[PDB]
Amino acid sequence: GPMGNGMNKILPGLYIGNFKDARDAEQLSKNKVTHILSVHDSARPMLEGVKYLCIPAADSPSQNLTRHFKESIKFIHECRLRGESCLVHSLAGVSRSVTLVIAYIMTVTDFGWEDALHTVRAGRSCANPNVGFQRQLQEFEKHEVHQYRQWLKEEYG
């Protein structure tokens, strides 16, 4: 459905869901979620037992998400390197959250944005960044992802 069917594993330690999934104690426990990247209109810390990164942002082509790629990647990566699990969520788990996860996948692989989107969709079929986020990801692939891959190597080996 258009808001998914529960949070979905994208890679080990990396999940995407909707806002309800992000407060679902059963889902959070089953998936061992200890970090939440919340990217939606009213993102703020809510639950106990969870490290948050909160990015108030709209699901619109006029919303800049590129300026949040680096902090999102650092947050996700440092969680995953410690063997912990991170949920990236938006309202629907379709666009804002998916875009940040695509940037992450592009940085930890050699993938362009389309192969990264394919990866996300294999785990969460409803993934579909808005057309503006798609263009931001294309620009990121063209001009900056190679700098991010080098930063990742320098900072984390």
Author numbering: -1 to 155
What did the paper state?
DUSP22 is a small phosphatase containing 184 residues, and the sequence contains a catalytic domain as well as an N-terminal myristoylation site. This enzyme is broadly expressed in different tissues and plays important roles in the regulation of signaling pathways, such as inactivating the T cell receptor (TCR) signaling pathway, activating the JNK signaling pathway, and regulating the phosphorylation of focal adhesion kinase (FAK). The phosphatase domain of DUSP22 consists of five twisted β-sheets and six α-helices, and the structural scaffold is similar to that of DUSP3 (VHR), while DUSP22 does not contain an N-terminal α-helix surrounded by the N-loop. In this region, the catalytic activity is facilitated by C88 in the P-loop and D57 in the D-loop, and the hydrogen bonding network is formed by D57 in the D-loop, S93 in the P-loop, and N128 in the N-loop.
The S93 mutants were combined with a second mutation, C88S, to produce proteins for growing better crystals, which improved the resolution (<1.6 Å) and helped to determine the structures. The crystal structure of C88S was prepared to compare with the double mutants, and it formed the DPN–triloop interaction, which was similar to the WT.
